From Swiss-Prot:
Induction: Up-regulated upon oxygen-glucose deprivation. Its EC number is 1.7.-.-. It comes from Mus musculus (Mouse). GO terms for biological process: cellular response to hypoxia; oxygen transport. GO terms for cellular component: cytosol; mitochondrial matrix. Gene3D superfamilies: Globins. Keywords: Cytoplasm, Disulfide bond, Heme, Iron, Metal-binding, Mitochondrion, Oxidoreductase, Phosphoprotein. This is Neuroglobin. Heme b binds at H62, H94. Changing H62L: Improved binding of dioxygen and carbon monoxide to the iron atom. Residues 1-147 form the Globin domain. Monomeric globin with a bis-histidyl six-coordinate heme-iron atom through which it can bind dioxygen, carbon monoxide and nitric oxide. Could help transport oxygen and increase its availability to the metabolically active neuronal tissues, though its low quantity in tissues as well as its high affinity for dioxygen, which may limit its oxygen-releasing ability, argue against it. The ferrous/deoxygenated form exhibits a nitrite reductase activity and it could produce nitric oxide which in turn inhibits cellular respiration in response to hypoxia.
Length: 148
C-alpha cells in the first residue's frame, strides 16, 4: 500500500482547516443534490436556501463531525475492519434521519471535488483512484445500516 501514502499525504493539506474544507464539501453537495437540504432539521425548522445552512451553529458542528469521521477512516486506511461496527451504526442513524443510500455516492463526488480543488496540480489520477477506493470501502461499511 503506497496509495495509502497518497491518501495520508493529500488529507494532511485538508486537515489544517477542516471547517473551511468541509464547507466546500457541503456547498458542492447542495449544488448537486438540493433535496438533501431539508434533512438538516434543527429545532424542527427547514433551511430555505443552501446559504441558510452556513449560518447554523448545528450545521457547522455537523461539518466538524464529518471531517472527524473521515480523519478516522484515513488513520485506519491500512485496516478499515476496525471501524466497521461504528460505521454500520452511523449508517443506521442516517437511514433514520431520512438519508437514502444513493445520496452517499453524491457525497463521495463532493469529497473528490473538494480534494481536487484543494490540491489542484497535486491531485493526480493515482490519488483520485486511491480516494475512490477508500471511499467505496467506507460506503460499503456504512451500507450495512440500510441492511446489507
Ligand atoms: C449525505 C448527507 C448527510 C446528511 C443529510 C446528514 C445529516 C445528519 C443529521 C441530521 C444528523 C443528526 C444531527 C447532527 O448530529 O448534526 C447527523 C449526524 C451525524 N453525521 Fe451526518 N449527514 C450526512 C452525512 C454525513 C457524513 C458523510 C458523515 C461522515 C463522514 C456524517 C457524520 C455524522 C456524525 C458523526 C453524526 C453524529 C452521529 C451520532 O453519533 O449520533 N454525516 N447527520
Amino acid at each position: 500500500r503506497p496509495e495509502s501514502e497518497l491518501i495520508r499525504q493529500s488529507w494532511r493539506v485538508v486537515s489544517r482547516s477542516p471547517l473551511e474544507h468541509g464547507t466546500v464539501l457541503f456547498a458542492r453537495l447542495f449544488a448537486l443534490e438540493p433535496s438533501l437540504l431539508p434533512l438538516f432539521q434543527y429545532n424542527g425548522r427547514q433551511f430555505s436556501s443552501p446559504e441558510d445552512s452556513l449560518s447554523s451553529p448545528e450545521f457547522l458542528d455537523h461539518i466538524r463531525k464529518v471531517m472527524l469521521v473521515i480523519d478516522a477512516a484515513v488513520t485506519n486506511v491500512e485496516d478499515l475492519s476496525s471501524l466497521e461496527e461504528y460505521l454500520t451504526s452511523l449508517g443506521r442513524k442516517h437511514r433514520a434521519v431520512g438519508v437514502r443510500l444513493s445520496s452517499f455516492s453524491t457525497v463521495g463526488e463532493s469529497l473528490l471535488y473538494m480534494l481536487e480543488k484543494s490540491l489542484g496540480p497535486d491531485f493526480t489520477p493515482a490519488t483520485r483512484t486511491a480516494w475512490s477506493r477508500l471511499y467505496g470501502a467506507w460506503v460499503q461499511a456504512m451500507s450495512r445500516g440500510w441492511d446489507g
